[PDB]
């Protein structure tokens, strides 16, 4: 056994494109619409609960997720990939910030951490 895939699966093409990132952005394009609007005294994020079956209880599937008491997240694209990112995002808010400074991270720095996890899935073996 052992993970013998120690090499990058995302490489530059002669045209200077990173294929797997472009194809990922194509998957996002197929995804259901989500939006965000910033007001003077708040921010709103919204999306459609595209129910796979009417027998399915769509309340049990959460597309809009609390990351910290003052930070929310919504997505477009592959749902499973979002669910594991929300789990990693919630955890990194604690391990890399709250367990050090004793307060929740500001929006821009939690974003920076989520951004880092996604960059690594773009270069790592």
């Amino acid at each position: 056994m052992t993970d013998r895939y120690s090499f990058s699966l995302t490489t530059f093409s002669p045209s200077g494109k990173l294929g797997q990132i472009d194809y990922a952005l194509t998957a996002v394009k197929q995804g259901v619409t989500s939006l965000g609007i910033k007001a003077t005294n708040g921010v709103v994020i919204a999306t459609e609960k595209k129910s796979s079956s009417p027998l399915a209880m769509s309340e049990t599937l959460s597309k809009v997720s609390l990351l910290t008491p003052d930070i929310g997240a919504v997505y477009s694209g592959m749902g499973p990939d979002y669910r594991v990112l929300v789990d990693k995002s919630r955890k990194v808010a604690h391990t890399s910030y709250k367990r050090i400074y004793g307060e929740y991270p500001p929006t821009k720095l939690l974003v920076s951490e989520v951004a880092k996890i996604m960059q690594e899935a773009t270069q790592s073996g």
Partner: protein, 225 residues
């Protein structure tokens, strides 16, 4: 001195507000009541750094667990996670905790010793003042206590510690956790030890102290132009 008292529709925990280094009182108004989760609080005795660190770590992991499961956290979870951590470190993490809370299962009161042992009770006490506190609890506790009665019993048990224990003192902090209600944290519920006015003002005339040198300290960043 930390106590927990179960009542009809909830659980109450109380603690004194003194921390001591040897025979010296380090803090006259310490906070020994810790929020593990919104409706799960615990009181700590032993090494002050150990009880704070262990409640913050488990409180963090409990919050991540709550978000993962989409369920309000359970006391048995915080209890299980605390005891497995303390047991790992074979008592070298000197955290002695009384863990109380209300959850969907009901009201719970536990105590956790630094070697990783736990116990269940309707009334518990821990720390240097536990024997003073347990003496009051064993005298006045009954089955089917009201909320008002349980607060009275809990604060009285802490007073016993404050008065009769040298390691305990100052004020009484209480936290009431009633089923189907918000936990109310009563910081300085009693103030039995308020210092009296001094005989003299020790405010000095200005210029009393001999100064070798004076200088402005630059706290601002490197300026423009």
């Amino acid at each position: 001195t930390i106590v927990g008292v179960k009542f009809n529709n909830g659980v109450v925990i109380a603690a004194d507000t003194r921390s001591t280094q040897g025979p010296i009182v380090a803090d006259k108004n310490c906070a020994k009541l810790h929020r593990i989760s919104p409706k799960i609080w615990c009181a700590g005795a032993g090494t002050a750094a150990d009880t704070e660190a262990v409640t913050q770590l488990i409180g963090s992991n409990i919050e991540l667990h709550s978000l993962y499961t989409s369920r309000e956290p359970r006391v048995v979870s915080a209890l299980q996670m605390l005891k497995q951590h303390l047991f790992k470190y074979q008592g070298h993490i000197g955290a002695y905790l009384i863990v109380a809370g209300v959850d969907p299962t009901g009201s719970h009161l536990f105590s956790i010793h630094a070697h990783g042992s736990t116990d269940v009770g309707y009334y518990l006490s821990l720390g240097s003042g536990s024997l003073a506190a347990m003496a009051v609890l064993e005298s006045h506790w009954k089955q089917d206590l009201t909320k008002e009665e349980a607060i009275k019993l809990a604060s009285d048990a802490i007073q016993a510690g404050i008065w009769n224990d040298l390691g305990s003192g100052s004020n009484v902090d209480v936290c009431v956790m009633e089923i189907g209600k918000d936990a109310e944290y009563l910081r300085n519920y009693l103030t039995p030890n308020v210092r009296e006015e001094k005989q003299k003002s020790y405010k000095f005339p200005r210029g009393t102290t001999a100064v070798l040198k004076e200088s402005i300290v630059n706290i601002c960043d490197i300026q423009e132009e």
